[PDB]
Every structure is written in structure tokens, then in C-alpha cells.
Symmetry: none
Subunit: 225 residues, 6 copies
Amino acid sequence: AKKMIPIDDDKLIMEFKDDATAFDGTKKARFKGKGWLNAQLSVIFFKLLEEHGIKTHFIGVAGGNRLIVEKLDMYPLEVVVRNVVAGSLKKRLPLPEGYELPEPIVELYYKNDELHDPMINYYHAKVLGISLDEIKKIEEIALKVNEILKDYLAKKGIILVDFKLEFGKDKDIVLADEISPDTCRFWDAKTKRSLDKDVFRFDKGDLIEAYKEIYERITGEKPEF
Amino acid sequence: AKKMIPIDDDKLIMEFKDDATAFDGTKKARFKGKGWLNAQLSVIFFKLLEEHGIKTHFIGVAGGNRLIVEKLDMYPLEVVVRNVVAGSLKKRLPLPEGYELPEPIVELYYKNDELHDPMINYYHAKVLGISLDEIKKIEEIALKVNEILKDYLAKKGIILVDFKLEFGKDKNGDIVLADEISPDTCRFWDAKTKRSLDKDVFRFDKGDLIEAYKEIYERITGEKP
Amino acid sequence: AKKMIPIDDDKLIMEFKDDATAFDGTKKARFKGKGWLNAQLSVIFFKLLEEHGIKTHFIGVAGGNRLIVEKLDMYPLEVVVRNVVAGSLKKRLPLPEGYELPEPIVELYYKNDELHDPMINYYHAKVLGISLDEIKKIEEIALKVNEILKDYLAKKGIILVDFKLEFGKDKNGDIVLADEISPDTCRFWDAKTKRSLDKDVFRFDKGDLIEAYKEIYERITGEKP
Amino acid sequence: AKKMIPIDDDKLIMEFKDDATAFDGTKKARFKGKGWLNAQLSVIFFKLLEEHGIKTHFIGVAGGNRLIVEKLDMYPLEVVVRNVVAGSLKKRLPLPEGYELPEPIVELYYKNDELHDPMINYYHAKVLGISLDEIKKIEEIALKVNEILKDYLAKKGIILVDFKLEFGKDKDIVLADEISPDTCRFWDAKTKRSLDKDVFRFDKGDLIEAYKEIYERITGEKPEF
Amino acid sequence: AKKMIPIDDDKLIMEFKDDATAFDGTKKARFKGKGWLNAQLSVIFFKLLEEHGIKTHFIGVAGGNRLIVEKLDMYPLEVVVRNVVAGSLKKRLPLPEGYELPEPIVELYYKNDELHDPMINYYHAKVLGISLDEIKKIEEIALKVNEILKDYLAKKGIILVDFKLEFGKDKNGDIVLADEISPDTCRFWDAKTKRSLDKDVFRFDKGDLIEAYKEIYERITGEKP
Amino acid sequence: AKKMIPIDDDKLIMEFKDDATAFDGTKKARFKGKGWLNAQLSVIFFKLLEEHGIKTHFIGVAGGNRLIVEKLDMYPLEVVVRNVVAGSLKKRLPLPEGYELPEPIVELYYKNDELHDPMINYYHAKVLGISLDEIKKIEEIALKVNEILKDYLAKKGIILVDFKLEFGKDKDIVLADEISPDTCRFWDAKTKRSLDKDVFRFDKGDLIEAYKEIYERITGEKPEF
């Protein structure tokens, strides 16, 4: 759903596609507009966070579905922040779906398609080369990012249930990858319906529909091109 | 394989049985002698650790397969310490079986038969009620225990690959090591051959269980049971 | 605007009045309903915070304008938390009115009518008897309280610009939030218009006080008093 | 009373004048010798501190009233250390003039003529770009400097009541500006009369008189040229 | 030179004698007045420190050469604080006699006549039962005491070169300064001449002991005994 | 027993000799093979530690008795780690020879032939220019190194009683000098006889004999050339 195209040593282009993928490829479809929407929600989000002094890889926009992003020495981590009990958190804690966590939970995953992204802790993280200090900073950034996204979305009747972040090191630790309904769980505050990729993962409705809603609610206008 | 029989408010009897169980009960057998051997290896281990000022629940022996143990407010934790890459750690790190970790790894499992003992971090731990301070103390005790057991077994040509501890709180608020310490709950490999001298022998039918446990016992005490 | 009536050693009555005071008494008026509204917004706030395990002095309600509150060893502090640049923070930082702070600011005031509540730091705090540990805890509680109030009001289109807390010590030695939490002690702005819905309306004659406080109440409870 | 004349990228000349200024310019005079005395007490002080491994901007002397000083990236801070209750500390704490503080007090001021140097804390300091770590180091240096100046002056019957410091960053945090009866409060130990700029601020005697005394008591000789 | 006479469980009498001892008893003499002077300088010092909230064992005076002191669980420590290079510190650092240390040095000695008071570190300290926390507190008290004694003596032209403290635990668990504080246990030099006004005068026959101690007393109290 | 021959700015040759020295030169002999054995046990040890990510000065082997070693800014420290009570530790603690320490002890010595390597603490260490942070890292490395050497030697029936380390700073803190029976105390686990330089220091047997034993027990082959 994303392709990374190198420019030079400092920067590259991140290209958002219309291809949507679930369950390791076994489920696939294409949604006209998804790429544009995802790139654009990413820009909105990265700029919002950068307003609060969050350092992000975002440099500029290169057309509707392409971002220009600074080049990074990437951590082999997928970091998940959770405000509301959903998905695999059910398999880990005795709490029903939708339960509001008293504090956000940070989970670390070793980014590794083959091991199917296994959860690790600080000891595994060290083995993979990430120091305790880096870890602590990564978690602190994530929770700072969690607070800004959650408060921002909540004012617009959107629940940030959870989301995934990636990070890398500039030549300082830097937030990377994307921030889109591909990588977050959003629920309508009133209804609790998904407005994210879960709609496609579990055929609970129209995907392009739900993503346009996010876009509409944030910008206050329908999606163009 | 263990039955807890209450006595009063301060203490209880832990009774080691000959029934052996794997894979949630779908694999079962009985090994004459296993109970006695497990109780006795536990006494040896608890007393050795208590020599180094490790607080344990062990009070005394009540016949060959029963231990008298102090009654605790138990942590809903299974704590795993790992010196050598084996088992599920292969699913978590890109490392072959038998690889010697540069430092020991500590993992936390939410003790819950239903969720099949899922792995948790400090954030999940708090949700379940365990403060960061208790966690830190639990991990430090576990690593202290890991060092005493590992050094001791290695002098006798035994590798402490990994092992599982449980803990509870006594009525001063002190954190206390509990459950058992036996070839049911540790991974021991012969140093020369790398064969298992633990429950793995029963789990995977790689030989005679009673045989491997007698070996542990023989190598430790120096006496053939 | 508040009168403290002692009951016994553990508890007292806090009574909210209709008398409103500004600029050390040189400006005064009476607003029919103000007392009832302030008592009631305080109950709402204390109970909301107590839902998140914030320890407060609130025990129960004793009629429309009286609260039953637990008796404390009070800190000679007024603690101010700030999300948005307003008031005297303009005199302290080169920032326009309405500027959104990237993080909340905590200020400490020595509670003393004579010195007209001067600002102090940790060093002054110690001189007055408050240890560095207590200070740290006070600021952490205040920031926790700031986050719960801010998120809650913002869902209802209300900006928590700033607010003042007081604290005291109960008879376990636990630090306890006290005084009141009302449009007398917070700065609330309508999110869309930025008008004041607090005492600033009375301080600077920018409208109808009873009107703005009823608004807070209406938006929160959803019921017109 | 000081003029900064640039040389190059690494260094500059600090020139001490005879012009004395109080209350933002509204009070002014000229004192023949003041510039010379101030430069010379600065040298004495900077060299004394540099004896104890305090890093200072002082490089050399360039004539009687000119110092050669290393160029710095300056903190927008005026940092005040206080041993004895005097001046505006009276407006902040319920203590009489002359009271000996049980510990020195450090106060931070935002250096800003327009806001008339307002007091800030660690949160304001961050907003202005100064990290908590820098702050902590700045305070630690100040208190180290406070101890050396206080002990040194006390042996010569002089009380270091308080004083102001400025700091900057070399290309390490470095003590800067000046250290003179313009920037410290000195009291005669026996009499409690001022031997500093307070003499000029409040017309309590002859300024050039009091400064010569400091010089005389320190060096053990009258002032030349 | 001191005899401890038990009274009861809370308190005892410390009695200062005229017998003076050096080099493990191989050098001995008697100085009429020494006991009285040592008891009295100790009272002065303990009361001065107790003015700054230093907890000491001093309860009251019981005649000219006896002190009433609170009974303690004593640390097997002699703790030495050093401002100026003298004695055995010459054997440890490449520094001439009289060199002024940039910071005070704290040394720990295992109090044991047999091993002739060997120097230990934190690791030896633990072996002997003293936790790292107690050690840290002991050193912080010692450095606080060092600063109060040093400043006080220096105003009177006396250099606190070094001195030895002992400590014990009272029955709240609070750490308490004990033994004595006298020219037997400190090194004092006249500021101008650098001659000794302490036991060094007796140790090395460099003058009249009773003479130097009377000097300390005279300079402090201002009264000739 | 070692000669340092410079190559260039990054590296040098460490040459192991057959000359053995004790008691500052007053005792000397030559042992054919000692140099070879010492170089070779050093290589074994440095490579073993470097397997665990311990940074060492070892670069390569240059013939049987010469090591190629990276050039360092050396700490003026001899750091001693002790597992078992022996030598001068007897003069510092009331414990018999051979007593197993409950935790390893780290001692610091100022490397200085003239002062005959005196013990220092953290305060002396600072005076000599070593910061508290460096010290803490040096001790942590030493204890990590202590654990790897001790466990490794214990499996082969050898007790690591104590040993000395030196460290320096690359252009990171780096383990340096040598690791040989010249710089460690080894005891046979069964007999408690020395297998180190103590054999030569106190004429308790054949030196070349004991060192060959270490070599034999480690490699599993007799010594060649």
C-alpha cells in the first residue's frame, strides 16, 4: 500500500497506492482514492505533530499521493499505543471490547514479516540492538504523539482506539512511516463503528466511505483529487 | 502435577504427584518416582537460594512428596528467565536453537490458562495491578536466582537453558519466591551432549523422563535413587 | 464566595455563596444562583476526578450550595496549570493571548493575601516547609487532573485555558486535592468563539456572569437550570 | 555600565564604564573609577572561580577597564542566588530583612528589559528553549560559585547577601557577564551597611567609597588606575 | 581519652580525660585541662550543628568534662572529611601538603584497632552490613557538617584541614552523629601561619598542646580559660 | 614482563617476556615459556569477552608472544575484582582466607609505582580527573567481565579468586593491559592450590607448571611454541 522510492542520501519519496492488503496477502482489493486519502491524512497528522515539536520524517508533498520524506536509519520496531481495548489486546488481558484503559498501553513488536511481527520487551529489544535509553525515548515520543492525536480526534467525535508508529534515527529519534486509517483504529464516538482498515479486514462496510468520513470530519470538506 | 492443600492462614502443603501433563491436557502419562524427585529437587533449590538470602515460600519437608510452604498473596505471573535460545524464543528473535544469550532475558506472562498464558509487558502488568516497583523487584530477584541456579548447575555439567518462577507477597509486604523449581519448570541440557534432562523429554518423546530426572538428582546430590 | 464551617476533626462544610469578589475586594457584586452553580460544578468535577482515582476532599453534598469535605493539613499553595497563554503568563513569556502551549505549564504561588499571592519556586517552597518530594507529587497530581479536566471539557467545545488547585494532607500522609473547581477558579473559553465562560466575565464586565456559568452547567449536564 | 565590542567569532572585549544606572534609566550618575574597579573585581572573581575549575568566559585583561572574553551562545537568563533575605525576596517570603537562609535560594529570571525581567520556573524555561538538564547544570554551577564567593568574602568580613549570574554555551555551559558590586549585594559583616550598588540606588552614602572598600579588603591595597 | 559510662537503654555519659595517646599507645602523656577543653569544644560544635538541624547524640552537659549522650546502634565507621591535603592523603594523591582541594573528600575507615582502621569503599561497607542508602546519607550528613564547621572556623582565622566523624542509629532508625568533635579529632591550622592547633602538636612535638587547644577555645568563645 | 612498542597513532604491539618480577624488583627470575603462555591466555580471554560484546584493546596476534593492541588514552587505574577473600583483603575485612564473598568486591587503585598503588575511592578518582560516570561504567564493565571469566573458569574446576584490570578511552571505555596468571588469582577448585603468580611470589611450587595447567585446562592441550 506504500512504495519507497529513493532520491539520494538525505531523502526519498513515499508513494501511497490504492492496493489494500490483509492477512499477509491472502485478502486483497483495490480502492480508488485510498492512496490519495492516506497520503493526505498523513500530511495533516505529521504537520499537526510537528506543530508540537514532534520530529517527523515529513519534508514535503510531491503530488496528491506522494510524500517527500527524510532518510532514516530505521528501528526494526512496530510500536503500538492503545487507549481502548480492541483486537489482540483481548488475548492478553481479561477485558471486553471497547473498555477504556485508565492509562495508554505501549506494546513493542519486532518488525519481521516472517516471524509475523512478534511482541518483544526491553530485553529482546536490546538483543536486536536497541538500548534502554532509545526505547525509553521511543515510548515517550509515542505517548506524546498519542496524546496529541487522541485529543485532536476526540473533539471531532472520533475515538483513537489504537495505532502503530515506526521510528528511525536521523544523522535524534524521528517518527516515520505513515499515520492513516491503515495504521490507526478510529471509532465514531457515538456509534462505535470503525472508520479505518477494520472495515476492509472484516467486510463491515465501504472502506473508501469510512476514510472519506475521517477526511471530511478533519478538514471539513469532502475528498477531491 | 502439584496439588495445594490449605492448612491455615500462614501455611499450606504442596503435594507433588506422578501425573505428568502437556499441551493443556491433551497429552498425559504417569511416571513412578516423578513426584518424589520434583519435591526433592525443589527442596534442594529453595534451600540453596535461601542460603544466599533469597526469600522463598519453603518452610519444611512433610514426607517424600509434600512440602510445607508459607501462604502468600500470589502475583498472577509466570516469570521466565532465559540464558540460551530455545522454544518460543525462536519465534521472537532471529536466533538458532542453542545460541548463548549475551545477557539473560526476563519475560512476563499473565498467568491465565484461558488466554493460554500470554506475554505481557510493564504496561499490561500495571493494568493487572502490579506496580512498576514490584515488577523491578521481581525481575531483580529472578535474575539473582538465575545466577545462583546457573552457576551451581554448570559446575555439574548442566546448562540452565531457561526456567519459570512464580512469586507472591507475604504479610510484611515482602516479595517471595513460590511454586516449584524442578525439571518440570526449567530447561536443563547436558553440557556435553545438549540432550534434555527435563520435561522436554516427555513433551516430545525424546527418551525416558524418569531417567533424565534421576540424572539431575544424581548429578546434584551424588547419590543414585 | 466560600465559607468554611468546621464540624469535627475529620470533616467540615464548605458553603458556596452568591457574593462575587475581584481585585482584593475593591470590586464586588452578588449573582443569584452563582453559589449553587459553583457547588454543583465542583461536585461534578471532584467525582469525575475521583473516578480516575484522584484523591479529593469531597465527601458528599449537603444541600444545593454546601459540600461536605474532609479535613486536611493544608499546603500554603495555590497551584496553577496552564494550557493556553492568558492573563499574567503574558507578563512572563513573549507570547500572544490564546497561544496553545506545547505542554502544560505548572506555577506555584505562595498563598498569602498580604504578599498578594507571589510566585515561588522549589527553593521558596522548601523554606515554607514543603519538601521536594511533596512538590513533585503535587505537580504530578495537578497535571493528571489537568489532563482529565481538559479532555472532558474539550469534548463539549470548552477550552480549559488555565485553573488553580489547592491541596492538603490527610491523616495517612496522602496528598489530597481540596478547595473548589468552578468557573471562579478556572479559565474556560468557548472553543468556537473564545469568549469567557468564567469569572473573567465579571472581572472585566464582558457580559452576564450567571449566563456564562449556566452555560458551563448546561453543556456539562445537558440540562437547563 | 558595560559595552560589548566584538572582535571575531571566538572572542570580544567587555568594556566597563563609569556610567551608573538605576530604575530603568530614570536615575543616572557617573562615578570616576567605577569602571576600573568593576573590571578589576570581575577579574579577581573569575580567576578565583577558575581556580576551582569553574569554566568562565574570561580570557584576559585589555587595560584597566576592558576584559577579553570568549564568545558565547547566551542563555536569556538572569540567575539569582541568595544567602540572606533582602530586596524583592521580602515580597515572596514572610521573613524580615537580614534573615540568614538555611540554604541558598536560586531564582530564575527571563532576561527581557520589556517584561522587566520576570521570574520564571522550569516550565517557562523549557518554553524559552532551555532543557531541564541545562537548567539543573546552571543551578548547580551557580551554587558552587555561590559557595566559593561566599566563603572567600566572609573571611574578609563581607556578607554575600545575593548576586546575579549569566551563562552561555561555548562551542559546555560557561559563566559570563560580570561579578562586581553592580551585580552582588555585599554587607559589612559587623555593621550590615551596603558595599554595593544599593548605596547608589538608595543614596545611602558614597558609591566609589563602598567599591574601593571591597577592593581594599580583597587585595589589601587602595585603588589605582 | 574518652570513657563511655552506661546509664540506661536510652542514654550514657561520655567522660573526657586528660590522658593523651598517639601511635597505638606507644606515645603517651597527660595534659591538665585537655579533658575539659575537649568536652567543651564538643558541646559548642554539637550545639552549633544542632542549630542547623543536624541530629547529634548530644543531650546535655554533666559537669566540665562529662557529656550526656543518647545511646545508639553504632556504625563500625570512622568517616573522614578533607578540605586540605595533609597526612595520609599525601600517600594517596600526587599533591603537596597544604593544597586546597577543589571539593571536600570523604573517606570511610573500618573502625577496627586490629586492622589499624583500614580504608574501605562502598563494597566493603555492604559486607560489614551498611547499605548503600545509609552510606549515601552518612556522606551527605558529613559534608553538611563539614560545611558548617568550615565556614564557622574560617571566620575566626581557623582552617578546618580535615576531621573524623562517627555515626549511629537511634531508635526511629534515624542516622545520628556521635563520638566527639575536638582538636583530638580534627585538623585545625591557623590561617595566617599554618601551624597546628590540634593533636598534631602532641603527635609530632611541634609545641604546647594545652596552648593550641586553649587557642581554639579562646578564638571561638572569646574568653581565656 | 610486558613491553609496549608503538606502531602509530591507532595501534601498538604488546610484547610478553619471560622475566618475572615481585616485590618491586627485589625478587626476580626468568621462566622459559611464561611470555608465550601469558600472551596466549590473554588472547583466549580477550576473545571470549569480545564474544559477549565487551570492548577490548585486542586487535590481533603478532607471533607467539606479541599482541597487536589498539592505542588508548589510559586511565591511571588498577581495578581489582574479588570473589574470594585473599591477600590484602584480609587486612581490610575480618574474614579468613578462602571465604566466598556474597557479592564481588570492586577496589580502585591509583596506578602509581611511587605511591606503591594506593587504594582510592570515587572522590580521589575525581581529583585525578575521572568523572563519577566513567567510574560507574568502569565498575560495571569489570563486574560483567568478572562474571564471564568466573563462570568460564569454574566449569573447568578453576576458582577466579580475584584479578586486576586496566582501562582506557578509544577515540568509549576499553579494557586493556593483560589477563593472565600474572594478573589473576586462580585456585584449583578441589585443592585450593594456586595456579597463578602467587606460586612465584611465595615459592609454593613450579610457576611454568601452574601456568601450563591453566592453559591445558582451558584449551585441552599441552603448551607448544
